[PDB]
Amino acid sequence: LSRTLRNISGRGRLTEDNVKDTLREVRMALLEADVALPVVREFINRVKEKAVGHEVNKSLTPGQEFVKIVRNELVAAMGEENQTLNLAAQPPAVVLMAGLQGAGKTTSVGKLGKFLREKHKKKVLVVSADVYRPAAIKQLETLAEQVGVDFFPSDVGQKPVDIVNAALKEAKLKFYDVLLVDTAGRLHVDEAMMDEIKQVHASINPVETLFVVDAMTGQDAANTAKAFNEALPLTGVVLTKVDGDARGGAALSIRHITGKPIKFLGVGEKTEALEPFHPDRIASRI
């Protein structure tokens, strides 16, 4: 894939124009076909501009220089460096989970609770404002018991905004380092549901607003991301179901469309299947 052609120009000191055109065509084709990405035109142009600017042929290792340009533009396209959760402000840190139904929001709250307790030694509250989907509040409660985080009780009778305000009060009164807020989603982008997410965000003033999206959705993930970024000040993105996306380019798309970093990757169904996103790692893998 992107590996194979990039290997063929790993150590070729000639870099003839046909060799550049052939390498660029397959990277264009693999980005376009291997995944649902349509902004490849911008990536190829930047790689072409840098190659002319840095005079790759002048270098002792022109193919290595050309691949270095491709990797560096890939790392930049994916966010340059890992950005962590916004936990250096004043406790409690409020993290709002936003996204469509089926993206993986409830599972990700459990994943983040495990990650925050085991790695950052933090006290964590989880609350669910999903009074619309059936059994969802119990689903968070069960996940909280599995990951060792505390749960704030919620009921279908309550209205989402009231639930979040009450949990924030517990988080401040009991000195919780982190409050994780799970929210209801719809399966397509819905304005009414987008209006209620706005009121919940306004009430709790979240330090972190995380957009959870399914990589398997492909191009639709970027469109969903733009709509959420437009109506919410997204601080980060969580890409789920990576373990089941053979294509693998929802990542590059989202950072381009939103300008917001991917902070975490969901790589499975279990609570430990969370991995922090490192653009320089992932870029080297492919």
Ligand X SMILES: Nc1nc2c(ncn2[C@@H]2O[C@H](COP(=O)(O)OP(=O)(O)OP(=O)(O)O)[C@@H](OP(=O)(O)OP(=O)(O)O)[C@H]2O)c(=O)[nH]1
Binding residues for GTP: 99-106, 182-186, 240-243
Q: Are 208 and 96 in contact (CB under 8 A)?
A: yes
Number of Cβ within 10 Å of residue 254's Cβ equals 27
- What's the rounded Cα separation, in Å, for the pair 250 and 21? 25
- Binding residue numbers: 99-106, 182-186, 240-243
Distance CA 120, CA 12 (A): 46
Interatomic CA distance for residues 202 and 92, integer angstroms: 16
What element of type H or E holds 142? helix 136-147
240 touching ligand X, by CB under 6 A: yes
Structure tokens at 277: 């996103």
Exposed e or buried b for every residue in 149-173, given b needs 16+ CB within 10 A?
A: bbbbebeeeeebeebbeebbebbee
Residue 261 DSSP class:
P
- With binding defined as CB under 6 A, does residue 79 bind ligand X? no
User: Any contact of residue 20 with ligand X (CB under 6 A)?
Assistant: no
Minimum distance of ligand X from residue 57's CB (angstroms)? 44
* Least distance in angstroms from the C-beta of 269 to ligand X: 4
Residue placing its CB nearer to ligand X in the complex, 133 or 247 = 133
CB of 210 to ligand X, least distance (A): 12
Burial classification of residue 98, based on how many CB atoms lie within 10 Å of its CB (0-12 exposed, 13-18 middle, 19 or more buried):
buried
Residue matched to tokens 């509040």: 137
Position 63 contacts ligand X (CB under 6 A): no
Q: Does 271 bind ligand X (CB under 6 A)?
A: no
241 is a contact residue toward ligand X (CB under 6 A)? yes
Q: How many binding residues for ligand X (CB under 6 A)? A: 22
Beta strand spans in 100-204 (E): 124-128, 150-151, 178-182
Asked if 101 is part of the footprint of ligand X (rule: CB under 6 A), the reply reads yes
Give the range of 13-21, 65-73, 132-140, 191-199 binding ligand X by CB under 6 A: 132-140
Q: Which is nearer to ligand X, 173 or 187 (CB)?
A: 187
Nearer to ligand X, 91 or 102 (CB): 102
User: CB 129 → ligand X: shortest distance, Å?
Assistant: 9
CB of 123 vs ligand X, minimal distance in Å: 22
Separation of alpha carbons 144 and 176, rounded Å: 15
- Is position 133 an interface residue for ligand X (rule: CB under 6 A)? yes
Is the preceding omega at residue 233 within 30 degrees of 0, hence cis?
no
Between 222 and 274, CB nearer to ligand X: 274
Residue pair 262/254 in contact by the 8 Å Cβ criterion: yes
Q: What is the DSSP letter of 175?
A: T
Which residue number, 51 or 197, has a Cβ lying nearer to ligand X?
197
Interaction residues for ligand X, span 176-215 (CB under 6 A): 182, 185
DSSP three-state, residue 1 = coil
CB of 110 to ligand X, least distance (A): 9
**Is 134 a residue that touches ligand X (CB under 6 A)?**
no
Q: Which positions lie near ligand X, rule CB under 6 A?
A: 101-107, 130, 133, 136, 139, 182, 185, 240-241, 243-244, 266-269, 273
